[PDB]
Amino acid sequence: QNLKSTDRAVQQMLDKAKREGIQTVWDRYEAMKPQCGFGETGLCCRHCLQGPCRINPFGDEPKVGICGATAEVIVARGLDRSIAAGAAGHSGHAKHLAHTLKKAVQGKAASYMIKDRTKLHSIAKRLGIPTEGQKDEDIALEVAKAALADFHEKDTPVLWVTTVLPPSRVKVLSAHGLIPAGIDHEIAEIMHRTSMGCDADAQNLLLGGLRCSLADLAGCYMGTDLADILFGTPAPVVTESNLGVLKADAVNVAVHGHNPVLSDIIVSVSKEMENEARAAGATGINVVGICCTGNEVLMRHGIPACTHSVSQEMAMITGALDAMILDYQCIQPSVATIAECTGTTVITTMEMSKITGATHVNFAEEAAVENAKQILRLAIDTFKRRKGKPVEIPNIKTKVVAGFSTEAIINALSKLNANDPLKPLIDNVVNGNIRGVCLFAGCNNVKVPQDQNFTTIARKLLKQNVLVVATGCGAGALMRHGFMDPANVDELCGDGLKAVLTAIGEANGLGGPLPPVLHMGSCVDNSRAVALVAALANRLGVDLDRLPVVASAAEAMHEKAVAIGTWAVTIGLPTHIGVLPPITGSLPVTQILTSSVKDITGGYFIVELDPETAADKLLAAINERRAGLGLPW
Amino acid sequence: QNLKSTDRAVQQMLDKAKREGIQTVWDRYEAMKPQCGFGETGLCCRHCLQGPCRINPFGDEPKVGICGATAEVIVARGLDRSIAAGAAGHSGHAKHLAHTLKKAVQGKAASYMIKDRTKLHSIAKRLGIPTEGQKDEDIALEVAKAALADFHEKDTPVLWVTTVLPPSRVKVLSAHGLIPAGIDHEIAEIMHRTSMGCDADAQNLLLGGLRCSLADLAGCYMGTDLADILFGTPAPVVTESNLGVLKADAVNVAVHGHNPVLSDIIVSVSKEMENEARAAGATGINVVGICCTGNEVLMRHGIPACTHSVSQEMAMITGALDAMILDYQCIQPSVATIAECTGTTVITTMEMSKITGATHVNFAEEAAVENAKQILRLAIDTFKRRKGKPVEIPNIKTKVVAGFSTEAIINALSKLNANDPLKPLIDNVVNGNIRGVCLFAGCNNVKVPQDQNFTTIARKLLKQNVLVVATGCGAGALMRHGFMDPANVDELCGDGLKAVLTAIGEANGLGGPLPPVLHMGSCVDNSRAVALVAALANRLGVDLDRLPVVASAAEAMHEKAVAIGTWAVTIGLPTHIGVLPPITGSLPVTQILTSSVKDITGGYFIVELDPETAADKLLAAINERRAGLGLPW
Ligand code: SF4
Ligand code: SF4
Ligand code: FES
Ligand code: FES
Ligand SMILES: [Fe+2]
Ligand SMILES: [Fe+2]
């Protein structure tokens, strides 16, 4: 099972699944081998009914699409559509939050409110929305309207791009025509330009992709902004992770998907229903997180993380998961079928994300508490139905310190320098105690033994004094392997990095260091990493493509991860991807993405499947940046 | 060559291409065989980096996607993305026209103006925009703003759906949640819901598809509305079609793509440059049309159609095509390479639609005349470079009577009944002189011998007294085979239909019938057919799903054709498709699309590759509708 997942709790559940004849993602992957080499290389096109078209990577015919589409066009069109799809997910999420905020302040959704007034005001100020002598509700209404306005063309470009990146960066991007006009506008334009008989120049197509990736960035940043206003900006919190956070004597409820609009209410209502749960013979309702929405409630409330990404089915295999409450994105639809074997009640809540065989309970923001109670009562009923049934919860969990929003990080640093909080970080970059910064982001992928890339690369970087920050299922991987436990600083961290983590931790009253890796939150909260890096850029008076900062989507899966990787490149970062995106069938496209894009944005992809080699390449990228700033490395 | 195209001019050019070693779409198709059966059936998914996934249509593993996505989910997601892509094209086109109208009336694009004031006012009235005591420029500004507003969420749904279909139809669609909230909104929502781990219920996914198809309808209708305001509502016009419309002694300039914003100016400026062209040794500039933008200028100005869709390369093979002026959509990128052999100057004009190797001349509406002149001067230079070179223009063309906008049709009918113009049409439906109405729409497809389905089905329906209307490359097929020549009425038409065409024609001063098939314009002008059918529905006090009206995308290719077929189904029409869309890998999806959707919208797909059988099925559909209305059949 170690060949499938490096997580021992997951290995234990794989054995149980095998024993019980429950097919898993790894089994479905095995059944899929060998996968289609045209698809793998990107040399397939189904954009019209003359297809499917393919191009032999090497050899003889077919060499070109039926319409004349070259390998470089077909590869760039496929990639662009993946970016658009990612953008559509992150921005759909953000749009949902924008409508919820609007409803809240118009009196239509009393379960929601402005929880972070300071965040609201700072966002308003960043957007140019006056606050002076204005009601919070009116400021919030204006912020919500601005959010919604960024989805379409108007007299300004997308403000959730132009107001969050330094002017110098916006200038470089504007010069290449890369600033998005509107989020859904760009998504639609990608789908148009990649449809048959339209855009057929690789460079032109890829530039459209870069621009659509910035529309994804805007959706991410908007999502984080709005979730913070509504639900609170995260601060350091201590919790736990892995399957051992499930409790046989509790009603175990997983929140799974992405949007805190749902999970946040689940969390608060679950506390209100403790006595009902105990009436049913449970100790209480034990809310646990899966995927991003688990990250959202972990960051804000310390809700323990059950599992992530590829291993999500394993939570069910325990026999103790009474409910899995879904909104959208990254939910393996297998869960609806597995539920029949495991007894878990899988509940969908969003009109556009249903799964055949799951129970659908519409969740309206206007009736959030009522709908939450309905959902949680299904969970309590399920708990009762497993009275007397043995469960197998692996007794495996890690301690997780998380909640490192950019505000939280700035606050932590301010204990070392009150009026110049970034300076201690920069001081230690300059003196070599911090070599650079690496953001781990994105998914697990069944092709990579689960977590192997994240942990292998993180271990090498931490020993080389890289400050490691993490989001999404990257943060999930690292938390499950102990990288968010400060007790592991001595083992994992180089002396320089240890010194800094310890210094900041001791200044914050901990008597101990910050954790080895800083959990910056969900995938939309990759925007937090952008906020930090942009604040560092502004403080140094240089652009992001001069900073010793890199990203690694070390086990990427979702179209969202492709969009995130692409905007990381577009904002100026060397960006590692540890799975093959479908680009290798075109050398020219690969060359643009891994090399010539440096001349456009300063960032570039690093495609490297071997994690030890990936680490070396990321370190080289970091050190090149150090050299560029005249620093020793 | 008859196995490739039924068009003799195309056959002649195929022989020339073969002789000269110029690879064509048919050669690239042959080189692609056998095509991938997973793609053909829809049983392939590349929506994440765990893929590519496939499902054996029959047999053993793989039976399910890696994430657990079933055949029915994978098929419905693929289809939905095609609908979104189609919607993105038609609506991008419409958006372009909306911005042009806005610029025109704000004084920023003096080459454009309100040409059809009556159309402007009627659209304003339909949208609820007051005109009483308003300047045309201000009304137009409000119409342009309303157009742009339909792309995003607002306090009203998409008005270019809700104001163009009868209330009863809007009610049925609203009841199923099918009315689009915003055009780009829906496009984005499709891309989201079809991304990994989101929507995973075939019925739910397909309903999203139906709704996105109505967003495509809105883009089509908006495009037609705006093009009419800007460039004039078509009226009956006589012209010619096929390769024989090229002239060895003229500068031959093809307008190819979709948007009249470009081609309309090309047409007017070309007339202004006659003396320059003659200075270069040409008789003049001979503008000819390819694809929809050719249809636009044919409908409004009588510009002859050179060719369409699959055979577009053949115009170049003549040796006489001096320029091919492109905007976007349906342009085989092969043209850029073929140009090198044929001498043709291929010119792209839109930022989001470039082709490697083509000359790009940016076309700004603000500088339309200047940019048009630059483009046409490249054409004149090219004409000069072929002085003394033999050309082979097949001496093959047909007479085409076209320009049958819905207003034109209503006007024609009004000569028989001034104050109830639809009544003569309905009278003849009731008495059996007109059996029903069939709209031919959409593309040619290299898989079908070019035009074979259109002409085979049209011939059978016309003999059975079906009133045949046509748009896009369906209209192209039929025009090239003589179906738009009134001299062919005796040969093609049943006695009943002949009687009616003759009656209307003689009432309109022709001394002869209307043509066998009524050309209703470009693909966005499928919206004109909707206007006619909706006016008939309103006049009869019944919904569209009770009318003896069917559609046939007999040789469909583009994602746009899939979107159009899907909205034809959604508005209540039996809708034939003569190529296999990638749905056969899921029986449940096929069953929904061909059967159970009847219970939702009253329309349904008829998938039938055999054109004689397709004709029989369309006739059966028509006659079933007749029976439903209590009429003999
Ligand atoms: S768009 Fe071109 S390459 Fe793609 S399926 Fe159609 S003919 Fe083939
Ligand atoms: S979304 Fe599911 S079926 Fe599609 S490629 Fe990814 S794992 Fe395979
Ligand atoms: S030929 Fe396998 S992905 Fe299309
Ligand atoms: S396996 Fe051929 S279309 Fe994907
Ligand atoms: Fe996520
Ligand atoms: Fe078209």
Question: How would you briefly describe this protein structure?
Answer:
Chains A, B: It catalyses: CO + 2 oxidized [2Fe-2S]-[ferredoxin] + H2O = 2 reduced [2Fe-2S]-[ferredoxin] + CO2 + 2 H(+). Chain A has 633 residues and is an alpha/beta fold.
Describe the structure.
Chains A, B: It comes from Carboxydothermus hydrogenoformans (strain ATCC BAA-161 / DSM 6008 / Z-2901). Chains A, B: It is an enzyme of class 1 (oxidoreductase). The structure is a homodimer of 633-residue chains. Chain A is an alpha/beta fold. Chain A folds into three domains: 60-234, Substrate Binding Domain Of Dnak, Chain:A, Domain 2 (Up-down Bundle); 235-403, Rossmann fold; 406-633, Rossmann fold (3-Layer(aba) Sandwich), CATH 3.40.50. Chain A is 50% helix and 11% strand. Chain A has a six-stranded parallel β-sheet with strand order 6-5-4-7-8-9, sandwiched between helices. The first copy, chain A, has a six-stranded parallel β-sheet with strand order 13-12-11-14-15-16, sandwiched between helices. The two termini of chain A are 40 Å apart. Chains A and B meet through helix 2, helix 3, strand 2, helix 4 and helix 9 of A and helix 2, helix 3, strand 2, helix 4 and helix 9 of B.
